[PDB]
Amino acid sequence: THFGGLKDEDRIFTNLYGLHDPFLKGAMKRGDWHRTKDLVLKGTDWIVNEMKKSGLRGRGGAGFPSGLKWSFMPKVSDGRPSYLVVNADESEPGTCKDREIMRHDPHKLLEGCLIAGVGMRASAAYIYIRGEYVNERLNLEKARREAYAAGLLGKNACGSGYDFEVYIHFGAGAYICGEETALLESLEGKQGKPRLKPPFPANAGLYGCPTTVTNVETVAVSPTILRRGPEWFSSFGRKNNAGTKLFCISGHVNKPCTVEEEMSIPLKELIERHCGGVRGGWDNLLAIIPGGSSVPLIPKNICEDVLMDFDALKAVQSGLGTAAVIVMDKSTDVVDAIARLSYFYKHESCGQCTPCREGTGWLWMIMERMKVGNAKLEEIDMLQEVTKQIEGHTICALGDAAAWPVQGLIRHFRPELERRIRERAEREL
Amino acid sequence: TEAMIRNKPGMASVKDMPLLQDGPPPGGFAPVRYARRISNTGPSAMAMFLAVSGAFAWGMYQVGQGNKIRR
Numbered sequence: 305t306h307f308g309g310l311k312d313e314d315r316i317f318t319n320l321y322g323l324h325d326p327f328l329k330g331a332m333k334r335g336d337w338h339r340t341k342d343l344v345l346k347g348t349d350w351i352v353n354e355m356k357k358s359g360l361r362g363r364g365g366a367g368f369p370s371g372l373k374w375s376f377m378p379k380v381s382d383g384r385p386s387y388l389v390v391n392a393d394e395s396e397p398g399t400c401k402d403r404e405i406m407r408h409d410p411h412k413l414l415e416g417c418l419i420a421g422v423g424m425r426a427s428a429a430y431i432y433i434r435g436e437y438v439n440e441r442l443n444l445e446k447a448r449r450e451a452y453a454a455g456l457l458g459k460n461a462c463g464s465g466y467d468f469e470v471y472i473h474f475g476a477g478a479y480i481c482g483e484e485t486a487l488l489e490s491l492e493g494k495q496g497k498p499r500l501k502p503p504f505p506a507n508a509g510l511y512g513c514p515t516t517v518t519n520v521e522t523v524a525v526s527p528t529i530l531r532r533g534p535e536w537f538s539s540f541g542r543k544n545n546a547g548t549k550l551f552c553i554s555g556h557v558n559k560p561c562t563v564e565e566e567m568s569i570p571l572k573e574l575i576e577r578h579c580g581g582v583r584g585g586w587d588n589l590l591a592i593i594p595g596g597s598s599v600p601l602i603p604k605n606i607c608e609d610v611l612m613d614f615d616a617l618k619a620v621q622s623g624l625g626t627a628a629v630i631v632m633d634k635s636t637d638v639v640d641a642i643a644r645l646s647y648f649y650k651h652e653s654c655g656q657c658t659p660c661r662e663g664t665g666w667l668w669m670i671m672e673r674m675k676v677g678n679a680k681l682e683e684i685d686m687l688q689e690v691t692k693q694i695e696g697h698t699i700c701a702l703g704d705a706a707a708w709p710v711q712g713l714i715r716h717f718r719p720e721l722e723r724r725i726r727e728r729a730e731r732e733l
Numbered sequence: 734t735e736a737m738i739r740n741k742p743g744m745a746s747v748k749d750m751p752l753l754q755d756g757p758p759p760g761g762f763a764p765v766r767y768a769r770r771i772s773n774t775g776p777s778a779m780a781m782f783l784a785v786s787g788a789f790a791w792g793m794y795q796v797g798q799g800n801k802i803r804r
């Protein structure tokens with residue numbers, strides 16, 4: 305078909321821009337907490353089944369099919385109280401879609417905590433707010449106190465027979481702590497250092513108890529996915545990728561904004577319609593980082609007709625992460641921008657594993673050389689090889705997230721890197 | 734390393750490294766002789782016998798004349 309058009313009655317995250325009251329008496333008017341008693345009474349298997357049928361995929365960088373992820377949790381509880389850590393923490397460069405759910409309609413996030421908790425047989429939800437979101441977690445603790453006073457959460461899930469309580473943890477400025485296997489530890493009290501995957505969080509995660517880490521957007525669309533139609537949700541986007549992603553058009557657009565819109569939308573259509581347009585017209589575009597910062601670039605010659613869905617952007621030698629589209633026009637120093645991205649991945653890398661801990665400082669040094677031109681024309685092949693040495697070997701996908709920006713920069717703008725290097729050479733002598 | 738040991742300011746690339754080491758000059762060295770050039774330009778078989786025989790023919794006549802003078 306032809307995607308992109310989402311009508312104001314189809315946007316799931318109403319009160320995104322905080323125009324209306326976020327808390328109760330303002331959330332019940334937006335349908336929040338509408339009839340969750342019935343949903344909880346409809347059971348856990350029905351919730352998982354409707355989430356799988358709705359084809360909701362991971363709103364976070366992983367892109368995993370939710371629901372199927374929620375079916376990983378154990379059915380019969382063997383004494384370990386299954387938890388539900390909500391990955392409120394983002395810290396991905398470009399990504400504010402979580403910041404508009406923690407505040408500005410947080411009750412959708414709390415009701416999603418509850419509905420996913422009954423969905424995955426959980427017993428408590430730890431909304432891991434990003435550390436810097438102080439005002440956001442204050443709004444969320446206000447809404448949590450409300451949903452506790454209104455009998456929604458705690459010792460009876462919205463009057464139902466489900467004991468489910470939402471506790472609000474908050475980290476402290478660490479993009480690495482945001483990872484699924486590192487959220488469990490940074491919340492366990494230890495450092496935010498990921499654990500290896502052979503113990504999966506669904507098998508032994510938080511406190512060793514089973515758990516599933518869900519981004520706020522996936523857990524927060526869960527309520528309206530169930531209350532509305534799972535067929536209605538899956539009616540958006542392409543076949544596999546389906547839903548209404550919450551985008552964040554980040555930089556070098558004349559009107560930067562985060563706006564919810566149907567997935568599989570043409571990136572050019574999103575840019576030209578909602579956020580205005582690439583500063584100086586579309587012909588001024590240089591590159592676009594379509595996902596968060598954990599995704600390769602798009603050099604504007606494959607950015608005209610690329611759709612903002614997981615599958616197509618993966619097929620374009622890139623990825624749709626948090627869909628925090630970062631736009632860069634012909635006026636920016638794209639090598640300097642990717643150098644600052646690699647500096648970010650050097651800073652926010654908990655250093656647990658050698659391939660990332662060291663090679664990311666290495667990538668930052670090579671990028672801060674190539675952005676001046678101090679390198680040699682064969683280093684652009686070392687940089688590719690260094691990134692491919694980091695990629696598959698790191699404990700978590702941060703290694704990926706640090707090798708992918710530089711890999712995409714090389715793959716696409718190798719002419720510009722080589723030009724800077726040759727210009728440095730001719731500047732000498 | 735090995736691009737920070739052989740600098741050659743500029744060079745834009747890992748090739749074109751200085752690479753100045755010992756070797757023959759452009760065009761090689763001169764053609765060096767190895768054969769045995771032993772010049773046989775001496776007195777021949779004759780001219781040596783005929784110098785000896787000639788010395789005997791005249792010098793012994795001189796010995797004779799000296800014997801005549803001494804006698």
Ligand SMILES: Cc1cc2nc3c(=O)[nH]c(=O)nc-3n(C[C@H](O)[C@H](O)[C@H](O)COP(=O)(O)O)c2cc1C
Nearest residue numbers: 362363364365391394396484518519522701702705
């Ligand atoms: C490199 C990397 C970056 C991540 N970035 C985010 C992020 O920005 N936001 C988030 O909620 N989770 C993030 N995560 C955690 C997971 O990838 C995933 O987003 C989360 O555990 C579940 O989200 P989902 O249920 O929507 O797939 C990140 C993990 C890795 C390894």
Ligand code: SF4
Nearest residue numbers: 655656657660698700
């Ligand atoms: S070194 Fe990189 S991959 Fe390893 S735990 Fe730290 S951030 Fe994750």
